């Protein structure tokens, strides 16, 4: 039932700006954490930052203040806007949910920092 | 430090069976959920299995019956038995870890080939 559909991915010109936002869709039944995990080329995954449910957030020592991540529940779609991107930050990125502890991931939006 | 030190990887061929462990070194924090996530070609990262601390074990629909998950709690190890493996459960195996009330890491990976 769940699906999580990503975009706003792709190339800039290193110390650009994007947005990627995470929709989601179906039935979790309770209000979830979502996380942002990313993959360089040729690497493991990473946690980059996260939004409990009651609001919590957290972000990865790495990207403080250049990744800024915010949840509207209404349309239940989460965001990651990423400002400063350096090269370090290519990668495909994928957004997560914890909703019993059901998990669910995104197919992934590619960003290469020039 | 929490060092995810994954194994057991490897080539099998069809209908054979392998079991996979996750070590876990250098956690502090209560009990965690440690589960496994595979990254397989044609479907993308996807979630298998996880096991939450009081024990609650939780499958994703297209492995109950072929997939278990456990834990030494003593060797701080968990383990995946992964029975008749279909050409389809190919891919890149990793588990992670998540202490929180979130944190969580993951470990280098693990290939497994269904042949």
């Known amino acids: 039932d769940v699906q999580l559909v990503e975009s706003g991915g792709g190339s800039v010109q290193a110390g650009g700006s994007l947005r990627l936002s995470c929709?989601?869709?179906?039935?979790?039944?309770?209000?979830?954490?979502?996380?942002?995990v990313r993959q360089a080329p040729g690497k493991g995954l990473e946690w980059?930052?996260?939004?409990?449910?009651?609001?919590?957030?957290?972000?990865?020592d790495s990207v403080k203040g250049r990744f800024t991540i915010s949840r509207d529940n209404a349309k239940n779609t989460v965001y990651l806007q990423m400002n400063s991107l350096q090269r370090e930050d290519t990668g495909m990125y994928y957004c997560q949910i914890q909703c019993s502890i059901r998990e669910y991931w995104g197919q992934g939006t590619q960003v290469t920092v020039s | 430090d929490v060092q995810l030190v994954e194994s057991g990887g490897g080539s099998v061929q069809a209908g054979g069976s392998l079991r996979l462990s996750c070590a876990v070194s250098?956690?502090?924090?209560?009990?965690?959920?440690t589960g496994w996530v595979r990254q397989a070609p044609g479907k993308g990262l996807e979630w298998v299995s996880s096991?939450?601390?009081?024990?609650?074990?939780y499958y994703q629909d297209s492995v109950k019956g072929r997939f278990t998950i456990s834990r030494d709690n003593a060797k701080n190890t968990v383990y995946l038995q992964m029975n008749s493996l279909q050409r389809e459960d190919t891919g890149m195996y990793y588990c992670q870890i998540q202490c929180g009330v979130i944190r969580e890491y993951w470990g280098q990976g693990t290939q497994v080939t269904v042949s």
């Open positions: 250098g956690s502090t924090y209560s009990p965690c959920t």
């Open positions: 096991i939450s601390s009081p024990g609650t074990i």
